[PDB]
């Protein structure tokens, strides 16, 4: 049950817990190799400075992730990069750091073919998360074979990143090896849904009572109390607005230019485990995980409100009875419930909070469900007939005319080319309705990856982009508009394009652009990066769809002005051609536009250029 | 939950010494804060000494500090009470207990593990 949905057992836990409790006393980190798993365990810290950075000028010690060091943690359509906090950042890159031999004693236990597990309690737990993702980014990303699937085990542990963080990691399906135990009213992983500002006073005296290796000398209970309530108004605040924003307000004044009831970005990431005396309940939806936090803190079971706030500064510390008892615990999946009503009853969640997590739950069904339809919508025959009908008849017979699908659509001087307008035109409705979806974060995290919609997608942007292209220039759009890479191009075959590289690239750690750029130099055309960059600025050579593209760039302007653009082209030509992004028989047809517009290039160039070969007869 | 057996109580002789033995189930050197506590005849039970999972720190109760010594053998996984100076109003009930993070040392209720203990019986 439980180890059927997390993969780890009681003994794991157990160890993680002992390892953790460890860490304390080792400086950054502490390995234990215990029979088939080897444990790190993060030493944890209790400071202001390691929860909000101090040169961290935003309101939640946030910063956004380098996109060379976790290529995947970013949405991939869209190209917005995942945002973590800051100071956890920091610990782990002292971590990372070569001189701290955790790299190597990493790779040691990756050597071993051990289940390699990352713990760790309070912020330590954040930086096992952290820790996590390197690896995954670092190792399993790269060879899945030989870099083994890792295990995250956190106790009490801040929030770390922010929804496109969870987001990534869900698309990724890397989100099921995190399990976060969380007491029902611990409130470290409640503080960062706090604005700094909220808390920056009475921080430090409650870290201090929070830190499990000093005494309690009856300091202060107003601090305490104050601390209590802060932290919990901006949850509410956040709380609400993600219930707001998630069915209700949509976007009112929910934009920037008014930073005024600035809400925290972090959100949960991975599997939750939400612990009472008689209970364990695993939540998966960072959504319903998010509205719990807020609901099961609340002075709700007894309503004992003058008790809360130390009763949340005691479940920190309350841990190890929670894995002592874990195996006396009766578990429920909440996901996967028919009834949530015990469950939440149990941990103190009230009618208005346990409408709002079935709510959430909800939402994420209705997602799976407009992906099913998706499917079955692009998986029936009346729909693969359009994209058949390009591929087997309308190309064939353009060939057959000797000058290509491409002009023929441009001139469109046959009722094919009406034919071929109007299935665009119904394969570009269904594709835009399945971005509109996407943009309003309504498929599940996993959509973007589905290797059946990229195969999908990638067909129908090879087949039908240089159809839309054709269209564009043959409404004269490039004189109004501007050129088609700059102000032209449907976001649904960028959106394509994306997904199909970081598909076939992440294997490599390389982001598609940096790739692009990588063979663009190696070409040799010897000129300066950043004039090369400006040279290439907004051009269609960064993908095989937009070749037209390009020509239609480049065509009736001097050589000496597209040079470096024309041979970035013909040096990008054969491997799109190999791996099927151009059609080698249509491109080089006599009345095709590029070799009509190749033919009248210099002779120099086309003696010395790759593609003699495909035009001998000019 | 570690098990914690006690041994080594008995009758002894006014100002005499005894050492109590705690044979605990798994290692506890910064893994559990350790105590001895006594319970008399009708009276609660009173905290007596700690070995702290923190520091490795020891402390006793005013009335044992400077005549009783905690100690741990971490090989033989033993927490040990050598009791010096011995009263007749030591005579008790001597429990070990294992908790975590115990940030008061002295209150039963911050440990979880005990033992059944063993009786020490002081005579005049």
């Known amino acids: 049950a439980f180890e059927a949905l997390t993969g780890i057992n009681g003994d794991l836990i157990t160890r993680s817990w002992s390892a953790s409790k460890q860490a304390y006393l080792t400086e950054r980190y502490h390995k234990e190799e215990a029979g088939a798993v080897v444990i790190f365990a993060f030493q944890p810290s209790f400071s202001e400075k390691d929860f909000f950075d101090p040169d961290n000028k935003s309101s939640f010690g946030e910063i956004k992730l380098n996109r060379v060091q976790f290529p995947c943690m970013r949405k991939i359509g869209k190209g917005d990069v995942a945002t973590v906090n800051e100071a956890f950042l920091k610990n782990l890159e002292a971590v990372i750091d070569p001189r701290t031999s955790f790299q190597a004693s990493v790779e040691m236990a990756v050597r071993s073919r051990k289940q390699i597990v990352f713990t760790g309690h309070s912020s330590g737990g954040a930086t096992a998360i952290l820790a996590t993702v390197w690896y995954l980014e670092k190792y399993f990303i790269r060879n899945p074979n030989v870099y083994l699937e890792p295990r995250c085990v956190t106790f009490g542990a801040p929030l770390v990143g922010d929804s496109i963080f969870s987001h990534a990691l869900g698309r990724e399906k890397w989100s099921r090896f995190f399990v976060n135990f969380v007491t029902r009213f611990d409130i470290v992983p409640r503080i960062t849904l706090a604005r700094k500002a909220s808390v920056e006073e009475t921080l430090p005296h409650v870290l201090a009572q929070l830190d499990p290796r000093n005494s309690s000398v009856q300091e202060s209970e107003q601090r305490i109390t104050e601390f209590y309530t802060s932290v919990m108004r901006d949850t509410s605040t956040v709380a609400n607005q993600a219930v707001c924003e998630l069915t209700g307000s949509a976007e009112a004044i929910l934009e920037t230019l008014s930073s005024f009831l600035e809400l925290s970005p972090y959100r949960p990431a991975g599997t939750f485990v939400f612990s009472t005396e008689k209970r364990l309940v695993a939540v998966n939806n960072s959504d319903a995980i998010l509205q719990m936090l807020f609901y099961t803190c609340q002075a709700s079971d007894e309503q004992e409100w003058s008790l809360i706030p130390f009763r949340s500064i005691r479940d920190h510390h309350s841990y190890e009875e929670l894995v002592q008892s874990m195996g006396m615990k009766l578990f429920n999946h909440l996901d996967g419930e028919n009834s949530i009503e015990s469950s939440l009853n149990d941990l103190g969640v009230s009618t208005r909070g346990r409408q709002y997590v079935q709510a959430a739950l909800e939402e994420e069904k209705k997602r799976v469900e407009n992906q099913k339809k998706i499917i079955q919508v692009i998986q029936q025959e009346r729909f693969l007939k359009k994209l058949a009908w390009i591929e087997d008849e309308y190309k064939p017979k353009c060939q057959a005319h000797k000058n290509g699908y491409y002009d023929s659509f441009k001139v469109s001087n046959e009722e094919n080319d009406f034919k071929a307008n109007v299935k665009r035109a119904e394969l570009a409705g269904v594709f835009d309705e399945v971005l509109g979806l996407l943009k309003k974060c309504q498929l599940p995290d996993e959509f973007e990856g589905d290797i059946d919609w990229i195969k999908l997608a990638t067909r129908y942007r090879r087949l039908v982009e240089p159809l839309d292209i054709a269209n564009y220039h043959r409404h004269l759009k490039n004189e109004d508009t501007g050129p088609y890479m700059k102000r032209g191009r449907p976001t649904r075959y960028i959106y394509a394009q994306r997904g199909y590289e970081h598909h076939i690239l992440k294997p490599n750690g390389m982001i598609a652009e940096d790739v692009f750029w990588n063979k663009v130099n190696g070409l040799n055309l010897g000129l300066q990066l950043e004039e090369i960059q400006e040279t290439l600025k907004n051009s269609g050579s960064e993908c095989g769809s937009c070749f037209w593209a390009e020509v239609e760039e480049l065509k009736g302007k001097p050589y000496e002005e597209v040079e470096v653009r024309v041979k970035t082209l013909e040096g990008m030509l054969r491997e799109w051609i190999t791996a099927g992004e151009v059609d080698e028989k249509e491109i080089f047809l006599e009345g095709s536009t590029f070799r009509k517009w190749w033919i009248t290039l210099p002779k120099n160039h086309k003696s010395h250029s790759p593609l003699r070969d495909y035009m001998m007869d000019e | 939950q570690v098990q914690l057996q006690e041994s080594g109580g008995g009758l002894v002789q006014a100002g005499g010494s005894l050492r109590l033995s705690c044979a605990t189930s798994?290692?506890?050197?910064?893994?559990?804060?350790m105590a001895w506590f006594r319970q008399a005849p009708g009276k609660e039970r009173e905290f007596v000494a700690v070995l702290r999972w923190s520091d490795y720190s020891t402390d006793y109760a005013n009335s044992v500090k400077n005549r009783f010594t905690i100690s741990r053998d971490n090989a033989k996984n033993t927490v040990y009470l050598q009791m010096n100076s011995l009263k007749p109003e030591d005579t008790a009930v001597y429990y070990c207990a294992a908790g975590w993070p115990v940030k008061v040392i002295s209150s039963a209720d911050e440990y979880i593990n005990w033992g059944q203990g063993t009786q020490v019986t002081v005579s005049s």
């Open positions: 798994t290692h506890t050197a910064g893994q559990y804060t």
